[PDB]
């Protein structure tokens, strides 16, 4: 159960942090836009 | 100048004997939109009960009084004036409740008559339960 639960969450969070990293490149693309619109 | 008492006065958070090759200061913003003052960030005193640079957390009530006496050390007596409403006679009566309050050595030049805001924290002494967060100098005092 520990093995399956840790595995499933590690997939979910990797997806969530990639959604937040598609936001991080949006944070970089926010700054390049901020300076050079 | 500091470390007058027997034991060594220091901020327990920071380490001051790092092997190398000025002392950094522990301080915190205390929330509720109160400004962490400059003598707290820059100064060189040691105070357990300073709400900015010490081990005490402000929670519960925030009150205001006017400074009455400043004779006992790192502590002041403020005087809180209000009106109590008797119902038989549709009139008020002028009452007062003066309370003991911890003044940090941060607030350097405070005179009597100053409108001192205080915040409730853990019992500091027998009669002391509040701590000075800001000071407003009495009307004028420019000259």
């Amino acid at each position: 159960k520990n093995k399956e639960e840790a595995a499933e969450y590690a997939k979910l969070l990797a997806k969530r942090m990639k959604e937040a990293k598609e936001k991080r490149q949006e944070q970089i693309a926010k700054r390049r836009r901020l300076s050079s619109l | 100048d500091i470390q007058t008492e027997r034991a060594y006065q220091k901020q327990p958070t920071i380490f001051q004997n790092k092997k190398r090759v000025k002392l950094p200061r522990y301080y915190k913003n205390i929330g509720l939109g109160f400004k962490t003052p400059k003598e707290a960030i820059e100064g060189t005193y040691i105070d357990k009960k300073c709400p900015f640079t010490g081990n005490v957390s402000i929670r519960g009530r925030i009150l205001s009084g006017v400074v009455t006496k400043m004779k006992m050390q790192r502590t002041i007596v403020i005087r809180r004036d209000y009106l109590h409403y008797i119902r038989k006679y549709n009139r008020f009566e002028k009452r007062h409740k003066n309370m003991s309050v911890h003044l940090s050595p941060c607030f350097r030049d405070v005179q009597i008559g100053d409108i001192v805001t205080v915040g409730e924290c853990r019992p500091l002494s027998k009669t002391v339960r509040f701590n000075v967060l800001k000071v407003t100098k009495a009307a004028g005092t420019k000259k």
């Binding site: 639960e5 840790a6 499933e8 969450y9 979910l12 969070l13 969530r16 942090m17 | 929330g31 509720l32 939109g33 929670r59 519960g60 925030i62």
Partner: protein, 262 residues
């Protein structure tokens, strides 16, 4: 006293149990459990007084000690067990399913559901907590811990759990334009759409809610439970749908129905 109390006098008992004065001296002191003592409904009161299957305490004991009653898909043979807000009472032999949700007034409704709806429930999160090795934990309103939640769920969101597995299916995020039931105060059982949240650093945050008929009412954020996205309830609502029509309207509806009935 010198320890925890065990008796509850019939007068000092929570009022929404609607207990009479002349039956007895004591009321069923609810056993400790997931819900609070003033915000619960003991299994004895629900079973004997509302449904009126049992007539007395002995009959309630006899009905439940045959392992017949099942609160949240788990069998409970305890008469004073606190069945609270968002529970799925599942009497198996009659083939009925009840969900405890606040009536339009400050009381619990005898609300029958379908067996397809009686397989999940709608839990509010109370705190999000980091474990012993970076294992995130939820703690819901009914004292139920779930570890490895969604990394998005935060401290006032609603989650939908499966009742056997005890794991999150969906969640409704706390923001404007979401259906919320009020679970405390004078506005107890009002269903409305969130209009504005007003932050009070140090005090309790107050949330303004709008009803379905343009009736607007506030309540402190402690007493709010989001049960829907937009205007869409995620469970079945009781007759009235948490409106609270005025005593003037409730008088008119009562006697007008009586006139037409005969």
């Amino acid at each position: 006293a010198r320890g925890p109390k065990k008796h509850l006098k019939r007068v000092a008992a929570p009022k929404h149990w609607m207990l009479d004065k002349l039956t007895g001296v004591f009321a069923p002191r609810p056993s400790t459990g997931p819900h609070k003592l003033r915000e619960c409904l003991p299994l004895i009161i629900f079973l004997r007084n509302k449904l009126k299957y049992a007539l007395t305490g002995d009959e309630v004991k006899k009905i439940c000690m045959q392992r017949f009653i099942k609160i949240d898909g788990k069998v409970r043979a305890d008469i004073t067990y606190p069945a609270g807000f968002m529970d799925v009472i599942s009497i198996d032999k009659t083939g009925e399913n009840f969900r405890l949700i606040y009536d339009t007034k400050g009381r619990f409704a005898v609300h029958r559901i379908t067996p397809e709806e009686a397989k999940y429930k709608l839990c509010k999160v109370r705190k999000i907590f980091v474990g012993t090795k970076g294992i995130p934990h939820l703690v819901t309103h009914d004292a139920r811990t779930i570890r490895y939640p969604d990394p998005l769920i935060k401290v006032n969101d609603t989650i939908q759990i499966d009742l056997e597995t005890g794991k999150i299916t969906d969640f409704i995020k706390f923001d404007t334009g979401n259906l919320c039931m009020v679970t405390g105060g004078a506005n107890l059982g009002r269903i409305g759409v969130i209009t504005n949240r007003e932050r009070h650093p140090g005090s309790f945050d107050v949330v303004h809610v709008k009803d379905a008929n343009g009736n607007s009412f506030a309540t402190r954020l402690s007493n709010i439970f989001v049960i829907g996205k937009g205007n869409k309830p995620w469970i079945s609502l009781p007759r009235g749908k948490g409106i609270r029509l005025t005593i003037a309207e409730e008088r008119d509806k009562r006697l007008a129905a009586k006139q037409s009935s005969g």
